[PDB]
Amino acid sequence: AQNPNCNIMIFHPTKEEFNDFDKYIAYMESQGAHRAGLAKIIPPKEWKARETYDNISEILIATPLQQVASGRAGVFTQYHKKKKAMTVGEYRHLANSKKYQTPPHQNFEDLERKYWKNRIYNSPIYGADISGSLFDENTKQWNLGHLGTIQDLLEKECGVVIEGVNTPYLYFGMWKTTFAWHTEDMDLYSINYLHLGEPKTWYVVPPEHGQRLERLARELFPGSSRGCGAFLRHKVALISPTVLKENGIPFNRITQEAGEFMVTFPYGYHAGFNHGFNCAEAINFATPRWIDYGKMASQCSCGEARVTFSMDAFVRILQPERYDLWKRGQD
Ligand SMILES: O=C(O)CNC(=O)C(=O)O
Ligand SMILES: [Mg+2]
Ligand code: NI
Ligand SMILES: [Zn+2]
């Protein structure tokens, strides 16, 4: 069995290997990459996403979100307070202000210590889930707006034609902006490209151990767990690496830098934080191996998780017994 310790693997495809996206994902899985729940892909030196980032300031962040924490430093939730619209140029100036800017630090490990010590005491502002793309239309390799759609994958594997579309999303971050512990909708893959700016640190639980994370989360968030049997779908709970180690939960960590891709694999729980002003692009995707995970994915029916249009068909076709209850949660 390849990668039996579930370590995060780092890949360096050549330009020739970077042509065929599906083939390279299957190659990484042949080497055991999915066992980690997360992999890093460094593009060949010949490749670029676009020519420059000099003309992005006028993109609008219609609903910036202030991430307000409650709890203790290592075990907290966050809620998202909506703020007034601002441009990417206005948000970058805000991220660089004395109130929000990255503090002085020695290295990524010192910054990680500072994040976990101090995050709860601040409320950083995140631009999230902004439909759009920063890949040039002429970038043919690993262009996250040109991937095969999940609807087409389901049709190819299962024969059933369904409604829905699959487009990318932009994220604009600042110091301490936080992504809570979650798997993807319908336990899909994700791919994330860090276009510019400061790093993103990730934490991940191997898919084979995801239920250990869920059992800890029920213990640490006992009111939320009574409210919903899949409350991590709400994307609000944070648990620090120190708390995970104290409780014996298997996990790994890695820092993504600008110019690098990360892939999350089906049922790989992940969480993380941004080091300073940055911009990322991400989309969900599927492969043949996903279908069995989609059939088994938990679902939130309490009303909190509220998701895209295109999840309807995935539940309807893969999980017909759960469909009626889940849809009641959507309405
Ligand atoms: O970068 C972020 O805030 C969150 N991204 C992801 O969870 C992802 O790509 O799967
Ligand atoms: Mg612009
Ligand atoms: Ni994710
Ligand atoms: Zn719920």
Curated annotation (Swiss-Prot):
As to how many cofactors bind and how, the note says: Binds 1 Fe(2+) ion per subunit.
| UniProt keyword annotations, A-Z | ADP-ribosylation, Chromatin regulator, Dioxygenase, Iron, Metal-binding, Nucleus, Oxidoreductase, Transcription, Transcription regulation, Ubl conjugation, Zinc
Example GO biological process: chromatin remodeling
After translation, how is this protein modified? Ubiquitinated via 'Lys-63'-linked ubiquitin chains. Deubiquitinated by USP14 with the help of TRIM14 leading to stabilization.
Recorded superkingdom: Eukaryota
> Which residues are recorded as binding Zn(2+)?
228, 234, 300, 302
Q: Summarize where Fe cation binds, as residue positions.
A: 182, 184, 270
Domain JmjC: from-to ranges: 136-302
Residues reported in the UniProt entry to bind 2-oxoglutarate: 126, 192, 200, 235
Kindly report, in one word, the top-level EC class recorded for this enzyme.
oxidoreductase
The cofactors named for this UniProt entry are: Fe(2+)
Q: What is a GO molecular function of this protein?
A: chromatin DNA binding
Q: Does the keyword Oxidoreductase apply?
A: yes
Q: Where is the protein found, in the record's own terms? A: Nucleus
What this chain does, per the entry, is described as:
Histone demethylase that specifically demethylates 'Lys-9' of histone H3, thereby playing a central role in histone code. Does not demethylate histone H3 'Lys-4', H3 'Lys-27', H3 'Lys-36' nor H4 'Lys-20'. Demethylates both di- and trimethylated H3 'Lys-9' residue, while it has no activity on monomethylated residues. Demethylation of Lys residue generates formaldehyde and succinate.
Listed name of the protein: Lysine-specific demethylase 4D
